[PDB]
């Protein structure tokens, strides 16, 4: 424990945030990292994050702030996502549109049919690079 204790307060939070940034830094985990940052920012309406941004390099700070607004736009559903209510392509005119393999979609998953798993899986994978979560007994492992 420390008398200032203020350092300890930001110490824990920074590490958590740091994990989110590493996801942002990777191209693959950018959606995941941005999405959590947006949600976290929503929880704390920012406020808490600013000290962290100054702490890191200045150039990198502008992009993250810009990226967060666009994530919300998708959540809002405004119009980027939308194209039509639900119209299937037709050559000329039909009584009823006919579904096709391209037009139709199939929901297939392989152990990743739950949202939390992506977070658990991606973060661990980035994380093992940082360290090892493998603990073993010193005596006859």
Features:
Cytoskeleton-associated protein 5; 0% strand; mainly alpha; monomer
| Helix share, percent | 40-55%
Please give the alpha-carbon distance between the first and last residues.
34 Å
| Count, helices | 5
Q: In what range is the share of β-strand residues?
A: under 5%
Sheet bearing the most strands, described? none
Number of strands: 0
Query: What string, H for helix and E for strand, traces the elements in order?
Result: HHHHH
The oligomeric state of the chains shown is: monomer
Instruction: Indicate the radius of gyration in whole angstroms.
Output: 22 Å
- Supply the helix-strand structural class: mainly alpha
Overall geometric form = flat
PDB class: cell cycle
Keywords: microtubule, TACC3 binding, cell cycle
Assembly: monomeric
Entry title: Structure of the C-terminal domain of CKAP5/chTOG
Description:
- The PDB classes it as cell cycle.
- The entry lists the keywords microtubule, TACC3 binding, cell cycle.
- It forms a monomeric assembly.
- The entry is titled "Structure of the C-terminal domain of CKAP5/chTOG".
- This protein is mainly α and 141 residues long.
- It has a domain of 71 residues.
- The protein is 54% helix and 0% strand.
- The chain has five helices and no strands.
- Helix 1 runs antiparallel to helix 2 and helix 2 crosses helix 4.
- The longest helix has 20 residues.
């Amino acid at each position: 424990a420390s008398r200032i204790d203020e350092k300890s307060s930001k110490a824990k939070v920074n590490d958590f945030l740091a994990e989110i940034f590493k996801k942002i830094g990777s191209k693959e985990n950018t959606k995941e990292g941005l999405a959590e940052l947006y949600e976290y920012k929503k929880k704390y309406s920012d406020a808490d994050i600013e000290p962290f941004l100054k702490n890191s390099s200045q150039f990198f700070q502008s992009y993250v702030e810009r990226g967060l607004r666009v994530i919300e736009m998708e959540r809002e559903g405004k119009g980027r996502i939308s194209t039509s209510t639900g119209i299937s392509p037709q050559m000329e005119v039909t009584c009823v549109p006919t579904p096709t393999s391209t037009v139709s979609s199939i929901g297939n998953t392989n152990g990743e049919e739950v949202g939390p798993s992506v977070y658990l899986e991606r973060l661990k994978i980035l994380r093992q690079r940082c360290g090892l979560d493998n603990t073993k007994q010193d005596d006859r492992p």
